[PDB]
Amino acid sequence: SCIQFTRHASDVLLNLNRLRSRDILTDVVIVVSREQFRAHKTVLMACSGLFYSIFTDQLKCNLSVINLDPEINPEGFCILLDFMYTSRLNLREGNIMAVMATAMYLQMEHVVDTCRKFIKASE
Amino acid sequence: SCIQFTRHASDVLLNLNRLRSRDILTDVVIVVSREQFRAHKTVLMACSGLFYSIFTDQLKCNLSVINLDPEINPEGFCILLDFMYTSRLNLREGNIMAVMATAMYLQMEHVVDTCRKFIKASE
């Protein structure tokens, strides 16, 4: 018999992004080919199968620095980190291959799906 | 020129609630008249003006235990904590007064608004 507030999840995510932009309560640095990205472990886990696996590991859960595979493109990661905190994906002809490869590595199934679809339309 | 995934914010919140239910990466205990509630500081801040003020304070941001005012009802808090992580509010004739008072103290404006409206309909 609950009532539901339609905009609640969006408002929560908007506030989480405001905390990220002001570097409030960020608890991890993600290193991508020397570029550094500060974030909240819980948000990374909520969006990515890879971060979910990493931060549920009894040793890795306590790390303040995570280094990604050197093949990972920093711009592709940045676009995906922005998507995690906003639901918005900056998908462009020039970045789609790097975004899809990064989303496959991060295990972000819905992003991988839209990249496959946009690539298929161009062929 | 971004594309947007409609269900992303809801899916993020659902995963944050899964982490709460399994007590994963919870970083604070909220004490309400001896009852204890584990949660994520970032989610509490994203939902409540009171928690936002508390965890942006340079001293309180580091506390692992927060004690609420003794007038706060533990059931009212529990219903609001559930709403924070699900967008669903269990509003009932028997709890509406405790839920509204707790939402006013926690500074959860949309919850206060629906409580005022439901009370006005019954008068």
Binding site: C2, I3, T6 | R88, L89
Partner: peptide
């Protein structure tokens, strides 16, 4: 607010 809605009935979910």
């Amino acid at each position: 607010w809605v009935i979910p």
